């Protein structure tokens, strides 16, 4: 009955998150609202998330991504893929069909199905930024819509990004709310006005 911690912890490496600009077009596949600290994106579409640090983490460091429900009444509930989509061939072989969050582009990804908590998570090795670039970029895939009956079922989620040493010890944490939908741009504008 333990809800993973979601408190911002820049840590010793000064860990921060970065996203890409995308405006509010309806053809936009992923857009992030600084105002809401919430990413709006579509099913199975690429979601770039940027890792920024002030000091370089020693190789052997990992980056974990995990989804938890945002509402207090559901926090203890495990976030998973609805049955309908578990029964779909989109399985790239690497990712267990029950995982909401996936990583594309990286061949060293591991999937954790936590025997004690029962939560799902996807982790990859930490890699320094690319030369000529100030940040490591990981590409995430959300395999269900926020509305999926049987899955997220309309409940908003938070994605927690964790920086860990090889032994799993916390080095840093950040997080952002996510809404997987048909019109990311449209929904971003709608929600930003609602403030």
């Amino acid at each position: 009955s333990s809800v993973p911690s979601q408190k911002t912890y820049q840590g010793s490496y000064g860990f921060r998150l970065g996203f890409l600009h995308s405006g509010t077009a309806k053809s936009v596949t992923c857009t992030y609202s600084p105002a809401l600290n919430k990413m709006f994106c579509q099913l199975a579409k690429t979601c770039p998330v940027q890792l920024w640090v002030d000091s370089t983490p020693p190789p052997g460091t990992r980056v974990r991504a995990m989804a938890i429900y945002k509402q207090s009444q559901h926090m203890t509930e495990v976030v998973r893929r609805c049955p309908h989509h578990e029964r779909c061939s989109d399985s790239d072989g690497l990712a267990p069909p029950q995982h909401l969050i996936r990583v594309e582009g990286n061949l060293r990804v591991e999937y954790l199905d936590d025997r004690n908590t029962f939560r799902h998570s996807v982790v990859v090795p930490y890699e320094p930024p690319e030369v000529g670039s100030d940040c490591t970029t990981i590409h995430y895939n959300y395999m269900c819509n926020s509305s999926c009956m049987g899955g997220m079922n309309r409940r908003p989620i938070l994605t927690i990004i964790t920086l860990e040493d090889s032994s799993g010890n916390l080095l840093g944490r950040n997080s952002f709310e996510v809404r997987v939908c048909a019109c990311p741009g449209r929904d971003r504008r709608t929600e930003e006005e609602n403030l």
């Binding site: 009444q73 998973r80 609805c82 049955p83 309908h84 009956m149 049987g150 309309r154 409940r155």
Partner: protein, 232 residues
């Protein structure tokens, strides 16, 4: 592409054993109340023909099955009684896996809230009508007095007095009530009496909205709560 969603009949003949179900629909996989019901019976699920909190309290784990939130007598009885409102997709995913799913991942929303101006998810709540003494005034047994009396009572009300609008002689003690729930057929004498006794008078919408929000809301936080409000 339609059986796909539907799912098969449960191979495990006792998949829903120990459960009772109440089905309704309003007026996104089309909801086939017939096939869904055969799926439940094929798994020994018990089919309740009308709300009954006897079996829902002792004999079975009752669930209301529907395609979305509704404003029906049965939806209200369940929201008021804490019987969960579940999507029929739960029955289908359960037959598909020949294994009971977590209905907590299939909850239907409670309903449309006038105050919030949007659909509200369902969340745990206290009896909204706990220890409320109600006086129901209307010119229809079934539809109003029989209907709301039941809903208010299972909603934790201490007492509900039915009193036929016109066809009833005002020999009651209006001071003993907290609220008068009524419609446009309310006798001017009662309104005038309530006004002086400072006892609030509302419309059924007040009751429904409390059921949807999950709490006792303002007797006057919205026009539709005036007993005399008409479409327009």
């Amino acid at each position: 592409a339609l059986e796909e969603q539907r799912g098969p009949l449960p191979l495990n003949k006792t998949l829903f054993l120990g459960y009772a179900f109440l089905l309704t629909m309003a007026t996104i996989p089309p909801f086939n109340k017939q096939y869904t019901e055969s799926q439940l019976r094929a798994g020994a699920g018990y089919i309740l023909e009308d709300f009954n909190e006897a079996q829902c309290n002792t004999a079975y784990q009752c669930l209301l099955i529907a395609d979305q939130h509704c404003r029906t007598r049965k939806y209200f009885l369940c929201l008021a009684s804490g019987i969960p409102c579940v999507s029929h997709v739960w029955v289908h995913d359960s037959c598909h896996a020949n294994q009971l799913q977590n209905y907590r991942n299939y909850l239907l929303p409670a309903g449309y809230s006038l105050e919030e101006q949007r659909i509200l998810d369902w969340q745990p709540r206290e009896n909204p009508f706990q220890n409320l003494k109600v006086l129901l005034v209307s010119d229809q047994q079934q539809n109003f007095l029989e209907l709301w009396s039941e809903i208010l009572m299972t909603g934790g009300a201490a007492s509900v007095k039915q009193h036929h609008s016109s066809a009833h002689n005002k020999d009651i003690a209006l001071g003993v009530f907290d609220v008068v729930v009524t419609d446009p057929s309310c006798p001017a004498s009662v309104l005038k009496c309530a006004e002086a006794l400072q006892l609030p008078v509302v419309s059924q919408e007040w009751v429904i909205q409390c059921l949807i929000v999950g709490e006792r809301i303002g007797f006057k936080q919205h026009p539709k709560y005036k007993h005399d409000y008409v479409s327009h």
